[PDB]
Amino acid sequence: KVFGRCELAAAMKRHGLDNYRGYSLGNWVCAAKFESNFNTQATNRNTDGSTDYGILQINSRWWCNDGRTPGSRNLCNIPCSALLSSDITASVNCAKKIVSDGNGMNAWVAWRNRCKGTDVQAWIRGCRL
Numbered sequence: 001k002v003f004g005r006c007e008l009a010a011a012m013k014r015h016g017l018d019n020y021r022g023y024s025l026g027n028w029v030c031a032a033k034f035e036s037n038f039n040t041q042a043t044n045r046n047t048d049g050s051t052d053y054g055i056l057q058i059n060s061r062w063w064c065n066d067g068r069t070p071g072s073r074n075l076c077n078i079p080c081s082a083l084l085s086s087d088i089t090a091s092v093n094c095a096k097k098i099v100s101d102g103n104g105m106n107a108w109v110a111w112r113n114r115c116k117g118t119d120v121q122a123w124i125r126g127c128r129l
């Protein structure tokens with residue numbers, strides 16, 4: 001499912017994302033945009049063997065199990081295919097444990113590099129929220 005901007009915002013806000021750990025909704029929506037393009041089915045292989053999954057490109061190294069990332073963890077307690085689902089709940093619930101990890105949303109490369117310190121509200125401008 002290729003989410004629409006304001007659609008995704010509504011759905012993150014509902015899953016308790018807006019202002020989670022101090023990160024207003026425009027953050028997460030930006031992150032999504034850049035990590036994944038609002039596509040729930042997006043993957044990328046990392047050079048080390050890991051694969052990033054879904055709307056926020058959560059990574060198999062630490063966070064989920066795809067059973068081809070040797071030496072990796074599965075700290076969210078899910079298979080990685082649950083992150084490609086058109087429902088985003090797993091994705092969101094995982095984000096909560098990652099964002100809470102002490103690097104904040106620096107955990108998301110795209111975010112730190114492309115959203116951090118910009119006007120993130122622009123991404124929620126025009127939204128029935």
Ligand SMILES: CC(=O)N[C@@H]1[C@@H](O)[C@H](O)[C@@H](CO)O[C@H]1O
Pocket residue numbers: 035044046052056057058059060063098107108109110
């Ligand atoms: C939380 C998470 O998985 N963050 C990943 C990061 O590990 C990786 O450097 C980058 C490219 O794969 O994409 C981010 O989404």
Ligand SMILES: [Cl-]
Pocket residue numbers: 005033
């Ligand atoms: Cl957009």
Ligand SMILES: [Cl-]
Pocket residue numbers: 024025026027120121124
């Ligand atoms: Cl915002």
Ligand SMILES: [Cl-]
Pocket residue numbers: 065066067068069070071072
């Ligand atoms: Cl594995």
Ligand SMILES: [Cl-]
Pocket residue numbers: 068
């Ligand atoms: Cl494989």
Ligand SMILES: [Cl-]
Pocket residue numbers: 074075
């Ligand atoms: Cl475990």
Ligand SMILES: [Cl-]
Pocket residue numbers: 065078079080
């Ligand atoms: Cl599994």
Ligand SMILES: [Cl-]
Pocket residue numbers: 011086087088089
């Ligand atoms: Cl949903």
Ligand SMILES: [Cl-]
Pocket residue numbers: 021022103104105
């Ligand atoms: Cl923080």
Ligand code: NA
Pocket residue numbers: 060061062063064065066067069072073074
């Ligand atoms: Na894993």
